């Protein structure tokens, strides 16, 4: 009884907790209701399997069990059987879901709402943030609805509720957010691309973090965490729950072996010891380690290593080159390993293989300057710009590239790879490539998500699918579509009403940012000087109608000024 296992290791609420939010991520569309009737159903049962081991059913697998459970209210997905019906389920996993964006009331209700009924007060969390983030990263939403209920309970008992929760809210709001992105990277890579590349991937982050660690500790480490985010990408919360607390557990054990920085950690409690873990700093760099060159390019024994064990051989040649450049990003550690790799294929076939891979790290040079360069360069424009009007650059530059993807995808894009200036350019140099290039490829994996719904540019399509390490360089060396053939204009598209005098600076920024994005569809070939020139305008439109009292037309007749002077340019 596969059921009773997981209960037992994972107890009731986290249980609860686990079935609820993979519920939510197979049927988004269903509401609440539905949802925890399904979850206590199948907890009561789990419980009459754990003492009675042999009762009906309980022989079954979770997916037998859950899928079921599914079609009791939901159609073709249920028209099927084992592997096929959940697979099916999976496919039906929805990036961008058209749910209703989530307002959150005055801090008096929610507050009654939680002192009041405090367990489905925090269920209901779970299951819009779980519906919403089909991919999030279960064990630590868990993590998170501690969080939230950590926040409540001292906020709504303090003098001002409001100053109190709000800012602890909008801070896991982010967090959140930026969690749910480096897992939804996590499961693309291992999805898209396969097991071999996040293995890579995993051992050259690790190798970073813990540069202290054997290589045959990190592989040892790689092959659990594969495990586990299989697991969790797949919808297998409840094993990969209960393995990645095994995986904690394993890590704190052996901290002596791994990180000097694990310390503050392995004190906690279960889940806050595993999140700690996952956000732990890289450790000191070992003191005398030896030049790479020795065993890797020098070394006549080489292509003969790489002969005998290509995937091990490549494994430790990351795995050392990572460890002593934590000021690298984990996709350029990559990017070094697969060229040379490439250049070992090309050399131990020719006569003299020594001299054909002798100079190899001449190769590195261009690789590692390039990441250097724009990294310099796109820092100190943003130093000069801030961080909105250099979101505005960004919303040019990636409109011109791909004109075809849709408006909203390219403002949220846009935006969020402006965040990167405020995320790294703050850093010294040292610590600015990780931080920047690997948090692009978060973004950049959120524009291929959401275009692979509904394919419109072959571009995109292209830098998303033949690398997932130069998905960054594929997009950078992008220009103008010069194919592109502009669209006309559309008066439901520049019509700029009243109802924007009410939403907040922020949501009136973004809809002053959808305009820009329909403007250059509309004129790729316009330069960055005329659409500052009518943007800086595009303001102005706006200062006025809002401060015209009893007056709506204001939007219709200011408008046609508008429309007017837009025509022109
Ligand atoms: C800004 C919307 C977020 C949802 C979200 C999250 I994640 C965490 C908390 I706390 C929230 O209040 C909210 I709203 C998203 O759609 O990504
Ligand atoms: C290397 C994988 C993760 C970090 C990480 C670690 I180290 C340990 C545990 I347990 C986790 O759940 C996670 I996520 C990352 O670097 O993105
Ligand atoms: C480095 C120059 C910018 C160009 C640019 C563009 I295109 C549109 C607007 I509006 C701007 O303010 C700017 I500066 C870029 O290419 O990133
Ligand atoms: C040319 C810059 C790259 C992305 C990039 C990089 I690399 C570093 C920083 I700092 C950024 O803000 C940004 I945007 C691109 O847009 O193609």
């Given at each position: 009884?596969?059921?009773?296992?997981?209960?037992k290791?994972?107890?009731?609420?986290?249980?609860?907790?686990?079935?609820?939010?993979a519920?939510?991520?197979?049927?988004?569309?269903?509401?609440?209701?539905?949802?925890?009737?399904?979850?206590?159903?199948?907890?009561?049962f789990?419980?009459?399997?754990?003492?009675?081991?042999?009762?009906?059913?309980?022989?079954?697998?979770?997916?037998?069990?859950?899928?079921?459970?599914?079609?009791?209210?939901?159609?073709?997905?249920?028209?099927?059987?084992?592997?096929?019906?959940?697979?099916?389920?999976?496919?039906?996993?929805?990036?961008?879901?058209?749910?209703?964006?989530?307002?959150?009331?005055?801090?008096?209700?929610?507050?009654?709402?939680?002192?009041?009924?405090?367990?489905?007060?925090?269920?209901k969390?779970?299951?819009?943030?779980?519906?919403?983030?089909?991919?999030?990263?279960?064990?630590?939403?868990?993590?998170?609805?501690?969080?939230?209920?950590?926040?409540?309970t001292?906020?709504?008992?303090?003098?001002?509720?409001?100053?109190?929760?709000?800012?602890?809210?909008?801070?896991?709001?982010?967090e959140?957010?930026?969690?749910?992105?480096?897992?939804?990277?996590?499961?693309?890579?291992?999805?898209?691309?396969?097991?071999?590349?996040?293995?890579?991937?995993?051992?050259?982050?690790?190798?970073?973090?813990?540069?202290?660690?054997?290589?045959?500790?990190?592989?040892?480490?790689?092959?659990?965490?594969?495990?586990?985010?299989?697991?969790?990408?797949?919808?297998?919360?409840?094993?990969?729950?209960?393995?990645?607390?095994?995986?904690?557990?394993?890590?704190?054990?052996?901290?002596?072996?791994?990180?000097?920085?694990?310390?503050?950690?392995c004190?906690?409690?279960?889940?806050?010891?595993?999140?700690?873990?996952?956000?732990?700093?890289?450790?000191?760099?070992?003191?005398?380690?030896?030049?790479?060159a020795?065993?890797?390019?020098?070394?006549?024994?080489?292509?003969?290593?790489?002969?005998?064990?290509?995937?091990?051989?490549?494994?430790?040649?990351?795995?050392?080159?990572?460890?002593?450049?934590?000021?690298?990003?984990?996709?350029?550690?990559?990017?070094?390993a697969?060229?040379?790799?490439?250049?070992?294929?090309?050399?131990?076939?020719?006569?003299?293989?020594?001299?054909?891979?002798?100079?190899?790290?001449?190769?590195?040079?261009?690789?590692?300057?390039?990441?250097?360069?724009?990294?310099?360069?796109?820092?100190?424009?943003?130093?000069?710009?801030?961080?909105?009007?250099?979101?505005?650059?960004?919303?040019?530059?990636?409109?011109?590239?791909?004109?075809?993807?849709?408006?909203?995808?390219?403002?949220?894009?846009?935006?969020?790879?402006?965040?990167?200036?405020?995320?790294?350019?703050?850093?010294?140099?040292?610590?600015?490539?990780?931080?920047?290039?690997?948090?692009?490829?978060?973004?950049?994996?959120?524009?291929?998500?959401?275009?692979?719904?509904?394919?419109?540019?072959?571009?995109?399509?292209?830098?998303?699918?033949?690398?997932?390490?130069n998905?960054?360089?594929?997009?950078?060396?992008?220009?103008?579509?010069?194919?592109?053939?502009?669209?006309?204009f559309?008066?439901?598209t520049?019509?700029?009403?009243?109802?924007?005098?009410?939403?907040?600076?922020?949501?009136?920024?973004?809809?002053?940012?959808?305009?820009?994005?329909?403007?250059?569809?509309?004129?790729?070939?316009?330069?960055?000087?005329?659409?500052?020139?009518?943007?800086?305008?595009?303001?102005?439109?706006?200062?006025?109608?809002?401060?015209?009292?009893?007056?709506?037309?204001?939007?219709?007749?200011?408008?046609?000024?508008?429309?007017?002077?837009?025509?022109?340019?």
């Amino acid at each position: 009884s596969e059921v009773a296992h997981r209960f037992k290791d994972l107890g009731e609420e986290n249980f609860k907790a686990l079935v609820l939010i993979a519920f939510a991520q197979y049927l988004q569309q269903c509401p609440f209701e539905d949802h925890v009737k399904l979850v206590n159903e199948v907890t009561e049962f789990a419980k009459t399997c754990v003492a009675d081991e042999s009762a009906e059913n309980c022989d079954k697998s979770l997916h037998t069990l859950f899928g079921d459970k599914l079609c009791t209210v939901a159609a073709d997905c249920c028209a099927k059987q084992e592997p096929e019906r959940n697979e099916c389920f999976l496919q039906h996993k929805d990036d961008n879901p058209n749910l209703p964006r989530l307002v959150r009331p005055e801090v008096d209700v929610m507050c009654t709402a939680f002192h009041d009924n405090e367990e489905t007060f925090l269920k209901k969390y779970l299951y819009e943030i779980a519906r919403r983030h089909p991919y999030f990263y279960a064990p630590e939403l868990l993590f998170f609805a501690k969080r939230y209920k950590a926040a409540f309970t001292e906020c709504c008992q303090a003098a001002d509720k409001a100053a109190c929760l709000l800012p602890k809210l909008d801070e896991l709001r982010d967090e959140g957010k930026a969690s749910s992105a480096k897992q939804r990277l996590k499961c693309a890579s291992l999805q898209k691309f396969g097991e071999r590349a996040f293995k890579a991937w995993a051992v050259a982050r690790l190798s970073q973090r813990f540069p202290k660690a054997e290589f045959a500790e990190v592989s040892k480490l790689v092959t659990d965490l594969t495990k586990v985010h299989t697991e969790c990408c797949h919808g297998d919360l409840l094993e990969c729950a209960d393995d990645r607390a095994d995986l904690a557990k394993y890590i704190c054990e052996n901290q002596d072996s791994i990180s000097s920085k694990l310390k503050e950690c392995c004190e906690k409690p279960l889940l806050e010891k595993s999140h700690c873990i996952a956000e732990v700093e890289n450790d000191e760099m070992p003191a005398d380690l030896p030049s790479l060159a020795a065993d890797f390019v020098e070394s006549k024994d080489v292509c003969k290593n790489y002969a005998e064990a290509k995937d091990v051989f490549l494994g430790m040649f990351l795995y050392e080159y990572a460890r002593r450049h934590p000021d690298y990003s984990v996709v350029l550690l990559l990017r070094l390993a697969k060229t040379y790799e490439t250049t070992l294929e090309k050399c131990c076939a020719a006569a003299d293989p020594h001299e054909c891979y002798a100079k190899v790290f001449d190769e590195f040079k261009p690789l590692v300057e390039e990441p250097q360069n724009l990294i310099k360069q796109n820092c100190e424009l943003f130093e000069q710009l801030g961080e909105y009007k250099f979101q505005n650059a960004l919303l040019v530059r990636y409109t011109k590239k791909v004109p075809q993807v849709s408006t909203p995808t390219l403002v949220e894009v846009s935006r969020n790879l402006g965040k990167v200036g405020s995320k790294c350019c703050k850093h010294p140099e040292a610590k600015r490539m990780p931080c920047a290039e690997d948090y692009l490829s978060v973004v950049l994996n959120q524009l291929c998500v959401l275009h692979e719904k509904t394919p419109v540019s072959d571009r995109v399509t292209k830098c998303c699918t033949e690398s997932l390490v130069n998905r960054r360089p594929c997009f950078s060396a992008l220009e103008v579509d010069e194919t592109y053939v502009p669209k006309e204009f559309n008066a439901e598209t520049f019509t700029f009403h009243a109802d924007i005098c009410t939403l907040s600076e922020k949501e009136r920024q973004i809809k002053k940012q959808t305009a820009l994005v329909e403007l250059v569809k509309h004129k790729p070939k316009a330069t960055k000087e005329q659409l500052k020139a009518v943007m800086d305008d595009f303001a102005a439109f706006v200062e006025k109608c809002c401060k015209a009292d009893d007056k709506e037309t204001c939007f219709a007749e200011e408008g046609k000024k508008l429309v007017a002077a837009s025509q022109a340019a």
